[PDB]
Amino acid sequence: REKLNPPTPSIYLESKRDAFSPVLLQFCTDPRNPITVIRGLAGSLRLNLGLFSTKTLVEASGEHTVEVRTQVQQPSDENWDLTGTRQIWPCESSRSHTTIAKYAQYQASSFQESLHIIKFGTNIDLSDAKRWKPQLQELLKLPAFMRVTSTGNMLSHVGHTILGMNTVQLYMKVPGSRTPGHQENNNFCSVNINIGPGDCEWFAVHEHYWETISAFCDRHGVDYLTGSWWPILDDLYASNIPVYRFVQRPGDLVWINAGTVHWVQATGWCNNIAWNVGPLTAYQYQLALERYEWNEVKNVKSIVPMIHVSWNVARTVKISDPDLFKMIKFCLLQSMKHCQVQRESLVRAGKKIAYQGRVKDEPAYYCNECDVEVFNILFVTSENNTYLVHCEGCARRRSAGLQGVVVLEQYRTEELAQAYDAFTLAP
Ligand SMILES: O=C(O)CCC(=O)C(=O)O
Ligand SMILES: [Fe+3]
Ligand SMILES: [Zn+2]
């Protein structure tokens, strides 16, 4: 009863100096704290939350696109079937698109009408640095490990944009607005700040229980990884799964630790901003690679290209944690062997490989057909200036085989071997 309703790890920062303490990093990344709420963070850091107010956003970019989710308004601990007799797991929302100005008007008018179907403004893109300069500069006041960009954040070594992960997303909400259950892409940590003026209610389960939650989704007819679902709490309690529940008030920052399963509902009218962080720790990296592998089994795109990222961190960051070092070193070796096996079988087949190289800000490539990361050896076809990249398997599966397929190598064996050899444990 007490164990199934654990208290939520909470922190108040008395000053700006408290927020920059290494103890804060330690507490938030601790595998025992699946979720942390930092009360009054905006205040303690003198963050100008007014820069993300609905009025300021409309002024900044009122015609900016907003993905709208249309939903039935219901209590945060309920999700009813269509007949209204039964709780169900699937949480269905109509997708559509509007502008910030239009959602703003609905948000403002909704609020006055107070002084049942709703609309939730979701995944609003704040990536354009010029369009959102004062907003993004404000987030430089955060301690390094929570910033959008940082040397200790894996997402800062991708070398290019991953929308919604290493760029900020905005959510504009009215009461009842729901974000259904998920783990973050590749189990990365998440940062969320409530601009407010209202509250959000959060629900969270520790990473350890994710397979049981996955089994419920399958039992209840919805895809765990990609589907839209809202847990029935009695089902979780009956399975002895502790559920963290709390309110995030305006100015509160929520830190969602690696792999934490979470879902959220607005209690009032508010805006939230969010992004991902990948702290360079053994715990984060292991969870990120586990999901990377599981994603492949389930044919779900890994939005973080973990092989590309591992090479990049290997080239530029000094790793002192020996557990993390061993994990990365292994991944790198496995990557070199995979590339070697491909080159050898292509040479035995009599197929030429052109050296292409890498250019600045180049994306990581994925297979057109199956969405796996395609690292280094690229199987390229010409669709109709339209080049498509394929993995080895999908290329071989073509009816004419590798005829008409151009094979490109982005890193020579020696480039990889030399980066690998220079990757050593820092003291
Ligand atoms: O505020 C929201 O609805 C998004 C919550 C979330 O999933 C996150 O910040 O990771
Ligand atoms: Fe999330
Ligand atoms: Zn493929």
Curated annotation (Swiss-Prot):
Range within the parent protein? 1178 to 1638 of 1643
Q: Which family does it belong to?
A: Belongs to the UTX family.
Which parts of the sequence bind Fe cation? Answer: H182, E184, H262
**What is the protein's quaternary organization?**
Interacts with TLE1. Component of the MLL4 complex, at least composed of KMT2B/MLL4, ASH2L, RBBP5, WDR5, and KDM6B. Interacts with TBX21, SMARCA4, SMARCC1 and SMARCC2.
- The source organism is Homo sapiens
Q: Which residues form the JmjC domain?
A: 131-294
According to UniProt, the name of this protein is: Lysine-specific demethylase 6B
Reported disease:
Stolerman neurodevelopmental syndrome: An autosomal dominant disorder characterized by global developmental delay, variable intellectual disability, poor language acquisition, and dysmorphic facial features including a prominent nasal bridge and coarse features. Some patients manifest autism spectrum disorder. Musculoskeletal features may be present and include widened and thickened hands and fingers, joint hypermobility, clinodactyly of the fifth fingers, and toe syndactyly.
Transmembrane region(s): none
Provide the binding site for Zn(2+).
C367, C370, C391, C394
Identify the domain of life. Answer: Eukaryota
Where is the protein found, in the record's own terms?
Nucleus
The task this protein performs is described as: Histone demethylase that specifically demethylates 'Lys-27' of histone H3, thereby playing a central role in histone code. Demethylates trimethylated and dimethylated H3 'Lys-27'. Plays a central role in regulation of posterior development, by regulating HOX gene expression. Involved in inflammatory response by participating in macrophage differentiation in case of inflammation by regulating gene expression and macrophage differentiation.
What induces or represses this gene? By 12-O-tetradecanoylphorbol-13-acetate (TPA) in myeloid leukemia cells.
